[PDB]
Amino acid sequence: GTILIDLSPDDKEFQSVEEEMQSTVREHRDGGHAGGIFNRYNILKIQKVCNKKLWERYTHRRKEVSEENHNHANERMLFHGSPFVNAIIHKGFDERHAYIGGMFGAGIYFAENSSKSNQYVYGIGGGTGCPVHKDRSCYICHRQLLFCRVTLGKSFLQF
Amino acid sequence: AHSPPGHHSVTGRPSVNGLALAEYVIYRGEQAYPEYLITYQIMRPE
Numbered sequence: 500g501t502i503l504i505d506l507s508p509d510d511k512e513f514q515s516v517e518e519e520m521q522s523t524v525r526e527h528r529d530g531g532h533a534g535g536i537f538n539r540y541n542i543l544k545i546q547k548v549c550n551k552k553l554w555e556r557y558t559h560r561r562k563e564v565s566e567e568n569h570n571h572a573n574e575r576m577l578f579h580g581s582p583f584v585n586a587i588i589h590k591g592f593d594e595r596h597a598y599i600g601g602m603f604g605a606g607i608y609f610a611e612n613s614s615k616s617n618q619y620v621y622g623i624g625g626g627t628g629c630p631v632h633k634d635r636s637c638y639i640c641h642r643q644l645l646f647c648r649v650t651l652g653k654s655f656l657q658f
Numbered sequence: 659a660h661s662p663p664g665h666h667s668v669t670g671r672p673s674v675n676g677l678a679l680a681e682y683v684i685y686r687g688e689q690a691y692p693e694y695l696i697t698y699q700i701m702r703p704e
């Protein structure tokens with residue numbers, strides 16, 4: 500029931516997401532071991548994801564969380580990278596598949612910095628790298644990231 | 659795991675080799691919507 504609306508690069512919607520991708524890049528202090536060596540991205544495509552079922556599944560939950568948090572949803576736009584984005588955009592995020600051996604438990608992890616999420620496109624620490632070259636620093640293969648509406652509500656600070 | 663009592667998510671800020679960047683975790687699928695699908699390559703530096 501999902502459909503992908505394509506954004507033209509002259510679209511200001513496109514330009515803000517692109518700017519957000521580029522401007523949040525950071526120099527990770529592992530020399531680029533997990534995500535690759537780079538400063539900038541080549542942004543090929545930005546698609547808006549329309550699925551009414553997942554949309555309402557979301558807003559409805561954001562209302563539940565809002566009543567619990569002094570009428571604040573505490574919403575955020577955050578990046579997410581994992582080898583399962585094509586599942587996620589059709590079926591929706593699913594805690595039953597969560598990263599079980601993460602720092603903060605079996606959760607669904609997001610990031611402020613795009614480059615931070617980029618480190619998880621090909622798995623934990625990148626693992627092997629791209630499907631075709633086994634190069635975690637490949638400039639040939641296309642990667643995919645999600646830019647998500649995430650409801651944080653009252654968030655607990657840990658570690 | 660789940661979210662601590664009274665709470666709805668987990669903000670964290672781990673430090674790798676000195677660099678601290680913010681992780682955010684949630685424990686219910688319906689608490690996030692994947693609004694934009696972004697296709698891209700990392701750019702090689704000249």
Ligand SMILES: O=C(CCc1nc2ccccc2c(=O)[nH]1)Nc1ccc(C(=O)Nc2cccc3cccnc23)cc1
Nearest residue numbers: 579580583586591592593596598607608609610616619
């Ligand atoms: O969120 C994760 C772990 C990897 C990850 N770690 C980070 C750490 C810090 C900052 C950002 C990130 C990050 O962006 N990613 N994994 C994860 C795995 C699966 C799903 C997910 O929703 N999976 C699925 C959802 C729906 C259907 C699925 C079908 C098959 C497989 N998975 C499905 C969500 C998160």
Ligand SMILES: [Zn+2]
Nearest residue numbers: 629632637640
């Ligand atoms: Zn490759």
